[PDB]
Amino acid sequence: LRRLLVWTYDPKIRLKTLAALVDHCQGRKGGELASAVHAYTKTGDPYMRSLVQHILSLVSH
Amino acid sequence: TEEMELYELAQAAGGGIDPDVFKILVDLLKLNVAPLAVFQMLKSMC
Amino acid sequence: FEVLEKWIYRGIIHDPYSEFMVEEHELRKERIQEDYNDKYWDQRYTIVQQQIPSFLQKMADKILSTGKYLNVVRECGHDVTCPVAKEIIYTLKERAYVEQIEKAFNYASKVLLDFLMEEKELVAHLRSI
Amino acid sequence: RIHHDVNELLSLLRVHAEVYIDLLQKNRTPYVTTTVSAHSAKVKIAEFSRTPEDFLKKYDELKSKNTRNLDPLVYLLSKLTEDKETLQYLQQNAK
Amino acid sequence: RNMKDFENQITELKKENFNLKLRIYFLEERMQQEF
Amino acid sequence: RARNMKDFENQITELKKENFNLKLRIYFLEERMQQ
């Protein structure tokens, strides 16, 4: 694609979501992280919801 | 008028109306009016 | 359309970024029981007229008037619900998935007056006046 | 519903029975969006070729503006075929 | 009676509705002052 | 052009139901706030 792009692009989709989301979720502990996870659950992005559910459930648990 | 679509469009090609009536006709596009009926009701009296 | 689905078949406003055609505010206190003036169309429940597509705007009044019937008697004592649930998704040159709105509206109408006419029965209660 | 400001006042604002019947003739439905315009009505500005580059350039900018009110102006672009039956009253009104 | 007096009264009753619309026009602009 | 001599019945109850309702109610939208 140029060099190495397709299987580094797959990681980029796993990683760029966190590099924004955890950077919005800095510092918040207990239920305050859960109120950030409310604002991120109400996100407009539908694929990023399911793609980050692995971590979003380990906030809720 | 006092709007970008009420005032600039009213004097583009040849232009010229009453300004308050032109603002009312520009506001009538947002009032979900049928384009022919209001002009026919204006033209049947004017 | 998934947000529309929640509002059409349940009394739930999902509200994504407030870009969906319906949203709820807390105007309920202005005219809580009676419609002293209107509340459930532009005010407590409000429709953003331009946030609807074309193929749904043709009955967006019925969309705005479906969910209310599921979420005004939920406060009053019957579980007003639609067990019908037809998923809404786009298709080439089709809007049958919006044709499902009429059935859901009439079902919400059916369960609402299936309360109102016989529990707090208007056909017998109203006679009093 | 609100016909006071934009139907009753707009009927009263005309300089010229159909005094109350003009609002019933122009009885708009607020639940509609049915514009009768087409792409053939874009050549209505070509008759006023006083400066046709700055008569044809405005429409793309008005479409690029985020208002959806540019659609019903197909008949309003042609306007009245009578000789200055709306435009010339402003010169009398300015005096 | 000549089949225009009755319809002239009908048009007068349309003018009554127009007068009520004018009273509505004054009412909805007086709403803004004290209330 | 020609008149069918029945629509005036519907028109009379239409103007009655509009005008007498609106006439008494609009003025006493004052009373709701003035009283």
Side-chain angles (χ1 to χ4, degrees), chain A, chain B residues 10 12-16 19 34-35 37, chain C, chain D residues 17 30 38 41 46 52 72 94, chain E, chain F residues 2-34:
Chain A
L1 280 73
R2 292 159 101 256
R3 284 80 141 183
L4 329 171
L5 298 187
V6 57
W7 327 123
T8 54
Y9 192 62
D10 174 328
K12 172 178 163 69
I13 302 304
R14 301 278 264 114
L15 292 164
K16 77 89 175 180
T17 170
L18 304 180
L21 185 160
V22 316
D23 287 3
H24 168 276
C25 292
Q26 305 186 82
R28 297 172 80 140
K29 57 168 284 178
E32 197 178 34
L33 184 44
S35 69
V37 180
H38 182 73
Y40 251 91
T41 298
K42 299 296 183 181
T43 184
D45 187 319
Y47 88 89
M48 187 251 290
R49 279 175 168 169
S50 182
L51 183 64
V52 79
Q53 181 62 16
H54 313 66
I55 294 151
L56 200 147
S57 191
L58 261 72
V59 166
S60 314
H61 150 258
Chain C
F1 290 148
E2 281 171 19
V3 165
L4 177 64
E5 181 278 278
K6 322 322 297 182
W7 170 247
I8 281 289
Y9 300 113
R10 309 111 231 279
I12 303 169
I13 283 286
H14 195 41
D15 164 46
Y17 263 122
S18 76
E19 85 190 56
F20 175 59
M21 59 157 259
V22 188
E23 62 192 314
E24 178 177 345
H25 307 302
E26 292 324 291
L27 191 127
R28 187 169 65 188
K29 314 174 304 304
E30 267 294 317
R31 55 204 76 142
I32 181 157
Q33 287 146 15
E34 56 161 312
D35 293 357
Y36 181 100
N37 196 4
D38 300 348
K39 57 165 175 289
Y40 236 105
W41 289 259
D42 301 347
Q43 312 82 357
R44 173 188 153 44
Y45 264 71
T46 196
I47 182 169
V48 182
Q49 185 64 223
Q50 72 273 24
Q51 292 177 335
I52 356 169
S54 180
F55 66 108
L56 284 78
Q57 190 277 341
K58 190 158 56 186
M59 50 301 300
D61 57 344
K62 292 188 167 181
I63 295 173
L64 172 68
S65 309
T66 304
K68 48 160 60 76
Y69 304 161
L70 293 110
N71 80 7
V72 298
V73 167
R74 191 169 301 284
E75 290 66 26
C76 298
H78 195 209
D79 183 29
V80 279
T81 193
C82 300
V84 282
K86 327 287 188 168
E87 303 302 331
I88 308 178
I89 187 61
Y90 205 70
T91 284
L92 171 59
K93 282 173 169 285
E94 193 85 340
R95 76 297 298 137
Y97 47 95
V98 183
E99 298 188 306
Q100 305 290 16
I101 297 291
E102 54 98 338
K103 268 174 288 189
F105 171 78
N106 287 292
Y107 201 84
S109 317
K110 181 58 168 296
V111 186
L112 165 61
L113 255 60
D114 199 53
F115 178 79
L116 180 60
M117 311 271 254
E118 283 85 46
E119 309 171 22
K120 309 188 194 307
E121 295 177 350
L122 182 72
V123 178
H125 185 89
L126 175 64
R127 298 183 185 200
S128 318
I129 310 188
Chain E
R1 177 170 66 79
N2 186 38
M3 285 144 266
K4 276 305 299 175
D5 42 301
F6 184 46
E7 283 84 342
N8 177 58
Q9 192 214 40
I10 286 317
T11 320
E12 164 262 308
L13 288 154
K14 298 295 294 292
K15 179 56 200 293
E16 183 162 59
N17 196 280
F18 210 64
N19 181 37
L20 289 180
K21 192 61 61 62
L22 186 60
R23 184 140 65 221
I24 278 162
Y25 169 70
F26 282 117
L27 180 116
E28 73 168 52
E29 300 278 9
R30 191 169 55 77
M31 168 50 107
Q32 295 267 32
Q33 293 190 305
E34 308 177 53
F35 313 100
Chain F
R3 213 282 287 276
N4 61 70
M5 286 268 178
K6 204 263 184 184
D7 38 14
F8 66 82
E9 187 86 306
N10 158 258
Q11 207 262 345
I12 275 159
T13 192
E14 165 210 319
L15 62 90
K16 173 182 180 293
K17 194 181 300 288
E18 289 284 354
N19 293 357
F20 183 47
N21 175 10
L22 200 66
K23 175 192 173 78
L24 276 52
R25 201 185 76 243
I26 289 296
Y27 186 53
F28 267 47
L29 298 183
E30 194 71 348
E31 186 274 345
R32 204 196 79 205
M33 323 174 112
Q34 160 272 304

